[PDB]
Amino acid sequence: PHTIIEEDTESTKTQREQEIIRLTQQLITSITAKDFDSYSKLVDPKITAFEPEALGNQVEGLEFHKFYFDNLPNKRNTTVNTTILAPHVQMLGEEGACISYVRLTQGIGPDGLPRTTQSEETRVWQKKKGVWLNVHFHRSVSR
Amino acid sequence: PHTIIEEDTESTKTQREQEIIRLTQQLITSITAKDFDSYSKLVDPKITAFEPEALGNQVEGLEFHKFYFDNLPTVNTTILAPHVQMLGEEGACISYVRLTQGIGPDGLPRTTQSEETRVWQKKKGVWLNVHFHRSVSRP
Amino acid sequence: TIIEEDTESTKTQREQEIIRLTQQLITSITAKDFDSYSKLVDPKITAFEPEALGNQVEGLEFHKFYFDNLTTVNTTILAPHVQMLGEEGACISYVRLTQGIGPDGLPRTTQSEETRVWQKKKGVWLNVHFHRSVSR
Amino acid sequence: HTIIEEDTESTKTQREQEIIRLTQQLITSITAKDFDSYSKLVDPKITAFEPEALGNQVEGLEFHKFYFDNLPTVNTTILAPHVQMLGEEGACISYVRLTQGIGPDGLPRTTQSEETRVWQKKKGVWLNVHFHRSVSR
Amino acid sequence: HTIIEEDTESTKTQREQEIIRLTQQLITSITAKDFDSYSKLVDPKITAFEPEALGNQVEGLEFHKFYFDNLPTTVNTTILAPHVQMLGEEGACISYVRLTQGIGPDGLPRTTQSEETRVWQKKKGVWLNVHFHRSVSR
Amino acid sequence: HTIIEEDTESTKTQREQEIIRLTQQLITSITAKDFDSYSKLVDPKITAFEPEALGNQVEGLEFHKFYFDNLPTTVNTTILAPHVQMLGEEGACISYVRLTQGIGPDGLPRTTQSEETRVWQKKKGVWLNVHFHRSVS
Amino acid sequence: HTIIEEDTESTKTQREQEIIRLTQQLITSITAKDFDSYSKLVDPKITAFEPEALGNQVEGLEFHKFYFDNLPTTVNTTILAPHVQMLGEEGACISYVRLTQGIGPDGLPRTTQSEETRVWQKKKGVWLNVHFHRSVSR
Amino acid sequence: HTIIEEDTESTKTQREQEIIRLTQQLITSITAKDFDSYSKLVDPKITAFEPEALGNQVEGLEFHKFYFDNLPTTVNTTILAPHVQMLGEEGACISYVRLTQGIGPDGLPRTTQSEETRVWQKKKGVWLNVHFHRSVSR
Amino acid sequence: HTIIEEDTESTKTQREQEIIRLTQQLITSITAKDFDSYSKLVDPKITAFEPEALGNQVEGLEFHKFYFDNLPTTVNTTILAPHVQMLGEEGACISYVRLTQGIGPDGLPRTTQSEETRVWQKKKGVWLNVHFHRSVS
Amino acid sequence: HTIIEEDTESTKTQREQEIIRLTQQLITSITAKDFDSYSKLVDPKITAFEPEALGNQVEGLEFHKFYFDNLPTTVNTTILAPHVQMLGEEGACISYVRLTQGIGPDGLPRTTQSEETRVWQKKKGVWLNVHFHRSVSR
Amino acid sequence: PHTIIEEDTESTKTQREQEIIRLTQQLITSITAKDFDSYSKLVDPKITAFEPEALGNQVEGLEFHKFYFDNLPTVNTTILAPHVQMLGEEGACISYVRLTQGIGPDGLPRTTQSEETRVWQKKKGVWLNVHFHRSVSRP
Amino acid sequence: PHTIIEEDTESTKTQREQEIIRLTQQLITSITAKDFDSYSKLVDPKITAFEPEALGNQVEGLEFHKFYFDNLPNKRNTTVNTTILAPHVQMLGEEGACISYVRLTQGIGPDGLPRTTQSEETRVWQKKKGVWLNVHFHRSVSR
Amino acid sequence: HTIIEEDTESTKTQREQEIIRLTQQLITSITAKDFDSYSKLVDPKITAFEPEALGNQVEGLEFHKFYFDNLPTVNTTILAPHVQMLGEEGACISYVRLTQGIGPDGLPRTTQSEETRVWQKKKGVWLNVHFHRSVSR
Amino acid sequence: TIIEEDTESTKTQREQEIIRLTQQLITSITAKDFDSYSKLVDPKITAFEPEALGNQVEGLEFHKFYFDNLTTVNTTILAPHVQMLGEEGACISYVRLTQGIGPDGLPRTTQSEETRVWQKKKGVWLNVHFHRSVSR
């Protein structure tokens, strides 16, 4: 029970930019649904990462995140609702792209408590042999 | 006194990504020296930014950072493990750990750490920083 | 049940309807009836609420998440100010006072300041924007 | 005192663009403490929801004029303005206001508020008849 | 479920005394959670200032009714130094210190104190409470 | 010192309009600390519930005169939603929310909210305040 | 549970000795929760100052009768240095330090302290407690 | 600085009115730090219960005379609801709530509260305070 | 229950040796909670300063008997540096440090230190404790 | 620099009274920081239990002398309910509650309370303090 | 489930120091699996150690760590930026950041970080860990 | 006003081990005296480090520490007394050595307050062309 | 219960080596709660400084025998033993004791104490006449 | 000045000298006279003190650091136990109670438990080990 929502606003993006947004949406769907095959198809095997689970280190490879796919609750236990706020997409020539957005996640905590979480995400995509892959992402949370 | 040091340890970088590292070094130099002219020369005027000064929002433009070049009142900035991924011919992405050694109220030494991602785009033959993302992890 | 408090007087016939429409809206919220809610709310509604964490959200899905989760409550509208905007605009602002039961068997009262902006689209009034605040 | 709008890379229609410009002039009169321009842009019977009102709804200019008369480097930034038009005489603009300033010490601090302003075209001119300021925790 | 009124020394006038009686009946309907007597003693458009209203002024019975619908035997209220000021033939203003005794979660005796001002209006020969103000000092 | 009153809606009767005006003059006399005007508007044996009384009920004018003589510049009192209920011909009861904008120890503006209930009694053709009740939430 | 007086030095007169014995019987009815014995020794219009009154002065038997109808074992109350001043034949005033030893929630022995001042009035040949004042030092 | 009494309702007898006036003169000598006027109104062997005694009962004038020789402007003491009970011709007992308004370290106005119980004895035609008890509620 | 005594150095006179022995028997009667032995060793009008008295000075046996009847297995009392000073022929004063090893609520051993001063008076040829003073640092 | 002793009611025997006097002189030498009078009233091999000794027993004058060498006008001590028990012809044991009043860093009046037990021995016809025990409750 | 991952990013190691990394991986595996036989095979019996379990003291021998192999009651250990400096023919020194992903009381995920230095000595043709130094920096 | 003291105990070390101890002493003397030339002579220009000033990162090169030589108070202001506790030296063939010890430092704080600091140090030495150099050190502090 | 000594890579003289072995036997009797071996290795008039004594100096075996009689996986490690001999009948051994154990939960905890034991050769056998246990903060 | 407290009795002539030597040692400490201190203390003295942070230190330099830094104090020795060890050993243990003035003008008292071990080296007694503890 999870669905990903984007809201660009009145602004209409480039068709290319629109595809980067759609791909990012698919990736987030892989993460919330914990489908590691779909995640792996969209992400480069040598992706560098900056996330709070890294404790200020930079991590490389898929295994660090495959830990979260193979573990953590399945997804049946609870329901989630992620939302992408103001996605800014900057194309970098023909083979690069950089999408940065605010991620707002609605869910249920330990009890039947509804809570909202905000994180700031930067994802860099590289067009490798006609296929866009996520080569680096950087996820922070405000204090 | 403001100096900037990179630490590539044993790995070897290509000339392109070595230049991305060099440009990032100059950028952070203009930051620590509060030289906004050089900073403006290295940064695209429509630059997006994620930083703790923005309170979890994404800001655009130069005025938001030019505020800090003004108004604000001996440090060593160190770039740790610069990962530079080239993106075709007009893209580049360098992520690193920014370690800052400095002085407190007294002659007291303290170190701060932030994780930075900077995205460079080659616009009309020159490299410009079009987006950066600065984080500080659970202190 | 919901209680309105105009204090004194009767509003004009146009803004009285805005008050009643707000009553039906809050009724759909408290009763968790999403059909009436979707009928009263524009599909591209912008929103400022504490559940949005200082962000502005748009669409119904963000709010429909709250309809699909979770008996006796008493909401009360304090000093409604309705300002009409031509023939196709209306802006109602009021203080929402809610009475309910928390985790234990103890009664609690919550206060929030709500500002709803209604638009008359093709003869029917729809809420296109609302702004919910909570004082500290 | 400099004010910057951030539409994203979008262009609004000619009608709502003026709502954006007028809002910038309003925030300008607020930051510069110029009550004359403020009074020209605001209806005298303006209802208001702001943290200075302590969860109450205030009306009139006197409550706000109290703030123009006290105290003499700031940078306000308008994040994601949404303008929904209401016929020919109504407009509703909502945005996130991001303020950079200097506090008691010489330290830069940033504050974020959410603002929703409702404008009414009264006799060919636009006046701000309602506004709602919230602050996230 | 017994309410004690403490006139201190000396005796007031009879008309003030009846206002005191009606206030007692009101608080009895409150501690006994008897909404019928409460509705008999209270005007349907009563204004109220109480800590449950969060610095707002509430009107009507539903705001207090809600409280009567939800709760359940052991209470004791005491009216401290009631001042009753008559207002012509149709007005009355009684103000007093309310002292309530009860039992919380665990079996320990606790006492709460509030300051109350109740305003009675003589409508059609009967007295009704048209406004009350409940405060608590820190 | 400015005392502003706002009724959300409706016109009061003439009598209760006067009750509102008399309350306004009273609050003015408090802010200006003119004890002669205050005493003219208030009964010499007025009972009172206010935070300065520490949950006690005080009577008389001296308890309040103490504040008139020792306090001893610019403040803004706003009166929100006055509910006036007349009691026959010789009684009246007005209850309202009071907002106070002022400057504290700093150069920073602060707002204070209190809920007030005043009871007026007409004696010999003159309305006097005989009891008031001020609480803060 | 039993109560113990501590006269320390010197011997009191035959009048004040009875005041101390009656105070002992009173506190005995308090610790044993026997309201009958308490009502025989207390005037029905008794004023009271106690921490359970929150700095107010309550009147009547019911304010204290609420406490008799709550909780059931072993306690030890001691009257430290009773000072009895007689006022003619119909007045008496005894002030003392009440020291209580008991068990709380856990299994521990403790010693609470309160200062009590009781005023006795001889009404129709019997001594009655018309006012008591309970204090606690910080 | 001046002291104000609040009799509220009713009129006291001619005897107890003098007890209240003498209490006013006493607290006046306290707030003005005039030990001469204080010594004229207080018996030299006065017992005392006050928070400055830490729950003990002190005797003599010097224990309080220490406070007269310390600190120098504007204060306001009010006697709330004085209850005076006469004991023949040579005894009197007044209990009241003392409410003090003053300025602390910073420039702020405040209202401290203490409960006072004073016992007056007529010794050779003059009334003297032989025992006072100062309490503070928490 | 074991009561151990240790003098760092020196031999006491015969009298003060007996004073030490009587104190030992007293502490034994407290630990074993044998009130008959305690009463035999203590004056019926004994004054006392102990933490159980809350800074007051208590007199008599009942105050202490309360603890004999309600407490109601293995503890180790060690008496450190007894200073005995005889006062003529009918007085004596012994002061010492008392260590107590025991088991509290847990299965963990805890040690308690208290400083005690006992005053013995010989009445009719029998030594009785007439005053003791127990403090804890 | 004045010490007040409070015998409460009634009068003790003369021999106990002199022990009280000598205790007063001792504490005067303490508050006045007069080491000569202190040395005249105290045996050179005095044992002591005081909070300054940290749960240890100290002996001799140097431990208290040290205190007399270092410090400087405003103090007031009061001896509460002195119990004096004579021990034959050469022993005496006085125990009491000491109540001290003074001024700390800022100009605020403060009161401290300690429990003291002093043991006097009649050595060569004069009384000397051979052991004292200073305690403070929490 | 216990796995161990190294992250050499772009740099290239020699076969010797690559084997030092491999041996360290096996060592940490025997730690997370609490397999003391393998651990003893990789560790010299007179090994010195600095670790927070030692409270600022330096311990020697195996019994101090064998205590933790006993008595103690799904994790991913990751070796970050392994710097391996060879010391002639019989010495080696590998220092790295040890990042540990694991589960709390609930199915709650948490990450811990420690900095480790391990010194290897070639004794009779086999490599043994003769000294290690484990630190945890200002959490 | 600073001097470095070693105390091996009754145990006598190897002559080689003794030299490693002496070299370590010289290095610490360079640090306390803030003589960067003497420090640089004993330390390898590509030394890796683990110290609390690195915030859980590993640092390489001299500049990170030359920051502390060129800044910080000179050394004239106060007096220091460092002490090396139980130095354990393990030789690694002919070209490696590993010395680990407890560092106890006595000094004066902000006021005239004497304070003691303990840190645990591991220093690795490499014999490069007949000259021992410090190639890695690891300094921790107990909690 | 296993005990490990850590001389560093040194060998003591034959006389002090026995002091080390005997100390190991003493700590063995302590960890195993075997009072018989303890009493054979310890002089009956042993003075003692330990945190269980609350800064006081205790003497005898009873104070320590109290601890052998209460409670039934531990690892003690002796760090840097210094043995200074005193003629033919005295010896002073001081060391750092490092203890690994399990607390209330199933969590491993480590404690560190500093111990100084003074042995005396009494009639050809070595007895521990004094010990001093400290704990750093 | 320093005060000894044998409580009662006189020690034997051999251990009395150990007590006096301890007095001279503490005198050199309080007066910060390092010459007498070095004369009374063996150059290879082991030490357990709170200034060593749970470590055992050896030598005079660690203590000489404290002689070269920083009027009226009163130290007192409580219940000294002196146990002789043959002809060339002695072990004295005692409670040290120190009276002094802190930062302000207020008197403070500190307590520590000291255990000194003396050795007769070539006819003269030297302190070869001492162990200073502080109770919490």
Residue numbers in the entry:
A (entry chain F), L (entry chain F): 331 to 473
B (entry chain E), K (entry chain E): 331 to 403, 409 to 474
C (entry chain D), N (entry chain D): 333 to 402, 408 to 473
D (entry chain C), M (entry chain C): 332 to 403, 409 to 473
E (entry chain B), G (entry chain G), H (entry chain G), J (entry chain B): 332 to 403, 408 to 473
F (entry chain A), I (entry chain A): 332 to 403, 408 to 472
Paper text:
Ca2+/calmodulin-dependent protein kinase II (CaMKII) is a Ser/Thr kinase that is particularly important in neuronal signaling and cardiac function. We reported recently that the activation of CaMKII-α by ATP and Ca2+/CaM triggers the exchange of activated subunits between different holoenzyme assemblies.
The hub domain of CaMKII-A crystallized at pH 7, while that of CaMKII-B crystallized at pH 4.2. The N-terminal α helix of the CaMKII-B hub is preceded by a 12-residue segment of the variable linker, including several acidic residues. In the structure of the N. vectensis CaMKII-B hub at pH 4.2, this segment is ordered in every subunit, and it folds back to dock onto the central β-sheet of the same hub subunit, extending the β-sheet by one strand, as seen in the structure described earlier for human CaMKII-α. This particular configuration is unexpected, and is presumably possible only because some or all of the acidic residues are protonated at the low pH of crystallization. The assembly is distorted at each interface in a systematic way throughout. The segment that is bound at the interfacial grooves in the ruptured N. vectensis structure is not the CaM-binding element, which was not part of the crystallization construct. Instead it is the C-terminal portion of the linker, which is presumably accommodated due to the low pH of crystallization.
